[PDB]
Write a protein that binds this ligand. Structure first.
Ligand code: LU8
Ligand code: LU8
Ligand code: LU8
Length: 284
């Protein structure tokens, strides 16, 4: 038998500290190829150990194809291969596109479905450990053609500090997080989910009105904010993203505002669960 292992790299769709993502081809089929920098090599190891422990399969989790370590000439290449989503990140999609009730709710409910699946322990040989993502953000969510999203990048994921500073929960920023308690990392995911909810809601049209794309805390921190910039805003001043007046003239945005507030409590144990959010979004 021949093992057809030739992947053609076609175009780079992302470059960063993490390394690079490429649109690739494997046997006519579109694949996404992440090439890790030496700087991010631990993320390849952590994600490969996760998938070697539990082979995640969910419509709202980026679909795993392969982890490859190759010997280059003097160096080790680390590759992650996943399904390819031509529409790109939620971050990219929201920049140019506005949403209606249906497309807005489809997006946020699919993210909550994916996050609930990560979070839940399922018992049995066909089951899974509970997983906290710890790096949820709009760049780590991909849009599918059927209008649902999938959660990506399990490089920081933990099975039962780190992440993007702009999305870090206050207990992470002020280092009060109960590091030994697995529920702590679920609570950090809910915080970041609340912020993504905010980024999506802004782009949903109501009464002829929409806000432009902005990242969380765009009005109170610079680009590439420092730990200290984030700690002062989120922990010391306890600021939270603005809810515009126009959202209170729409039933959906009014419900989404309530949900994001219940993601943003300074007290982590006061925050909604992914499962409670999935239910509330299904009712909206
Ligand atoms: C090594 O590397 C890559 C390989 C492949 C790939 C290509 N053809 C066939 C295969 C294959 C899978 C599974 C079996 C089974 C058959 C039943 N038996 C009981 C156990 C073994 C055999 C063959 C693979 C794995 C794709 C890749 O990525 C898209 C690879 O990564 C570069
Ligand atoms: C990694 O990814 C892809 C792999 C393949 C692929 C290529 N050759 C053989 C296989 C295979 C055959 C059979 C078994 C089973 C069935 C029986 N059982 C008792 C033992 C094991 C497993 C694997 C696959 C899965 C195709 C793909 O897509 C067209 C892949 O994705 C891009
Ligand atoms: C976040 O994380 C990972 C993501 C992906 C991934 C999967 N599908 C599609 C993409 C993608 C395609 C295209 C654009 C843009 C670029 C050009 N512009 C004109 C609009 C489109 C953006 C994004 C990505 C980045 C793969 C990964 O690993 C293999 C990731 O890491 C786990």
């Amino acid at each position: 038998r021949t093992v057809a292992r030739d992947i053609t790299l076609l175009e780079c769709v992302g470059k960063g500290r993490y390394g690079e993502v490429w649109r690739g081809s494997w046997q006519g089929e579109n694949v996404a190829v992440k090439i890790f920098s030496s700087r991010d090599e631990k993320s390849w190891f952590r994600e490969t150990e996760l998938y070697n422990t539990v082979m995640l399969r969910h419509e709202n989790i980026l679909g795993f194809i392969a982890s490859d370590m190759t010997s280059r000439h003097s160096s080790t290449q680390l590759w992650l291969i996943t399904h390819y989503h031509e529409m790109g990140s939620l971050y990219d999609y929201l920049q140019l596109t506005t949403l209606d009730t249906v497309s807005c709710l489809r997006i946020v409910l699919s993210i909550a479905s994916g996050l609930a699946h990560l979070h839940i322990e399922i018992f049995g040989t066909q089951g899974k450990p509970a997983i906290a993502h710890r790096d949820l953000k709009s760049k780590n969510i991909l849009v599918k053609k059927n209008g649902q999203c999938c959660i990506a990048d399990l490089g920081l994921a933990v099975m039962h500090r780190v992440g993007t500073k702009r999305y870090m929960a206050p207990e992470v920023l002020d280092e009060t997080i109960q590091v030994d308690c697995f529920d702590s990392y679920k609570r950090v995911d809910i915080w970041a989910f609340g912020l993504v909810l905010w980024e999506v809601a802004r782009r949903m049209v109501s009464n002829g009105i929409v806000e432009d794309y902005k990242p969380p805390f765009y009005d109170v921190v610079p680009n590439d904010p420092s730990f200290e910039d984030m700690r002062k805003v989120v922990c010391v001043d306890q600021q939270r993203p603005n809810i515009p007046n126009r959202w209170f003239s729409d039933p959906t945005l009014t419900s989404l505002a309530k949900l994001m507030k219940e993601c943003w409590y300074q007290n982590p144990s006061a925050r909604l669960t992914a499962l409670r959010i999935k239910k509330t979004l299904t009712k909206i």
